[PDB]
């Protein structure tokens with residue numbers, strides 16, 4: 001009973017520690033490593049700063065309030081502490097909203113995956129975000145627009161040991177809509193179209209990129225022959241210069257064995273043309289290919305890339321079942337191949353593609369798409385932590401006191417605790433994980 005408040009104190013103290021530690025680690029990693037200095041990571045800094053202020057200025061005094069069962073920091077700090085609280089929550093959802101919009105234009109840009117913003121313009125945005133949040137949060141609280149007019153609230157306002165957030169319904173509705181719901185709805189809508197667009201960008205180039213790997217330097221394939229890009233054979237000759245000679249010939253310049261990713265895509269597309277042509281000539285492969293849809297045509301091409309035409313024509317039973325759109329039966333047979341035994345992961349995705357006729361097997365495989373997922377998790381996690389609390393806001397406007405006071409406080413703390421989640425989610429990123437490892441004397 002009094003023992004538990006020490007124990008509750010310990011837990012809340014660990015929460016405060018976790019928020020401050022992780023977010024300082026995030027802020028440090030971005031500031032210290034030049035690799036992590038992207039426009040996206042500038043917003044992550046704004047997001048991490050808001051969470052940090054929560055862990056320092058907001059959460060500790062909220063904890064003391066609950067443990068001590070009263071406000072011991074006076075009326076001025078109460079209004080100020082309340083203003084900071086609201087600001088940080090407003091700033092976070094606005095920043096998240098900016099990231100989603102930024103990511104949208106980056107992915108729909110001809111110059112792909114980089115922002116339409118210079119590093120300075122991005123900073124201006126961040127500053128503007130904090131200012132708008134400040135205007136939205138600090139102004140109404142210090143102007144006393146939020147206050148309710150009934151007596152009980154007036155007692156609490158006047159009382160120096162009472163810090164309760166009593167509000168008039170006009171504020172409760174308008175504030176929670178402008179601060180939270182509006183940037184929420186935008187963020188959810190916009191980023192959902194970010195996902196669609198990323199899913200759109202999956203094609204045979206990405207498929208072979210994932211299944212085979214893209215090499216910018218001249219390398220030797222398993223057979224010892226010189227190759228480059230996505231399994232593009234340059235020459236069977238043992239001389240390197242000839243492979244370079246062949247490469248320069250195909251590319252159209254002096255490469256010295258190194259090409260760009262886009263040049264590799266030219267070569268790959270160049271190869272695909274030959275791969276399709278050979279398939280249409282092959283008597284055993286043409287009927288299957290004619291019958292197949294575009295997606296499954298890519299899966300077959302993927303196999304011809306790996307095995308050659310002769311190898312693929314070996315699956316006589318699987319080919320006939322594919323031709324008859326008996327996908328599952330074709331999958332059972334393809335699983336029993338030498339091909340599945342040697343490279344099971346690649347075979348699994350190709351076979352799965354044959355089953356569904358979709359790209360749902362080459363999904364969040366690209367490093368860039370995994371990054372989009374991490375940002376998705378950040379947004380989702382925030383939504384789920386704060387939405388219940390913010391629903392109750394509106395619920396009590398309709399009909400007040402519908403929900404117990406301890407429940408409302410608890411939901412707020414689920415919202416508070418969110419500030420500690422983001423640094424942990426960033427460990428999904430390989431770059432952040434490596435940045436963290438260096439920073440922790442590991």
Ligand SMILES: CC(C)CCC[C@@H](C)[C@H]1CC[C@H]2[C@@H]3CC=C4C[C@@H](O)CC[C@]4(C)[C@H]3CC[C@]12C
Nearest residue numbers: 042045046049050053057084087123126127130
């Ligand atoms: C309102 C009081 C209590 C807290 C002040 C809010 C602070 C944390 C806000 C105010 C202006 C913000 C910044 C505005 C400009 C940028 C530049 C960018 O490269 C990193 C983030 C950064 C630096 C912002 C995050 C942190 C920031 C400094």
Ligand SMILES: CC(C)CCC[C@@H](C)[C@H]1CC[C@H]2[C@@H]3CC=C4C[C@@H](O)CC[C@]4(C)[C@H]3CC[C@]12C
Nearest residue numbers: 027028030031032045049052053056057058084
């Ligand atoms: C206002 C009280 C309650 C909290 C203290 C605010 C501190 C933690 C905030 C306010 C201004 C912030 C900074 C503003 C400028 C940037 C530059 C950026 O490249 C790294 C983070 C950094 C250095 C911020 C980190 C922390 C920071 C110093």
Ligand SMILES: CC(C)CCC[C@@H](C)[C@H]1CC[C@H]2[C@@H]3CC=C4C[C@@H](O)CC[C@]4(C)[C@H]3CC[C@]12C
Nearest residue numbers: 016017020021024025028055056438439440441
């Ligand atoms: C009031 C309470 C929350 C203050 C607690 C401050 C703690 C969280 C601060 C104070 C000193 C900080 C550390 C100082 C030493 C380093 C090494 C650096 O390369 C990365 C950050 C790191 C690991 C800091 C992490 C957190 C840290 C331990």
Ligand SMILES: OC[C@H]1O[C@H](O[C@H]2[C@H](O)[C@@H](O)[C@H](O)O[C@@H]2CO)[C@H](O)[C@@H](O)[C@@H]1O
Nearest residue numbers: 212221231232233271275304305306308
């Ligand atoms: O057989 C047609 C394609 O073969 C090469 O690419 C293969 C390579 O032979 C093989 O060692 C490896 O396992 O797979 C790659 C592709 O996944 C050619 O040089 C391509 O241009 C041909 O289309």
Ligand SMILES: CC(C)NC[C@H](O)COc1cccc2[nH]c3ccccc3c12
Nearest residue numbers: 082085086089090165172175176179393
């Ligand atoms: C202990 C209390 C003070 N903490 C409130 C939440 O942490 C933050 O709640 C909000 C954040 C941003 C805008 C907001 N408008 C509101 C209207 C009513 C209640 C909370 C909020 C609110």
Ligand SMILES: *C(=O)CCCCCCCCCCCCCCC
Nearest residue numbers: 017020436437438439440441442
């Ligand atoms: C490598 O980066 C890991 C070793 C870093 C050790 C730094 C020691 C920090 C001591 C923290 C004590 C501060 C407590 C502050 C409480 C208010």
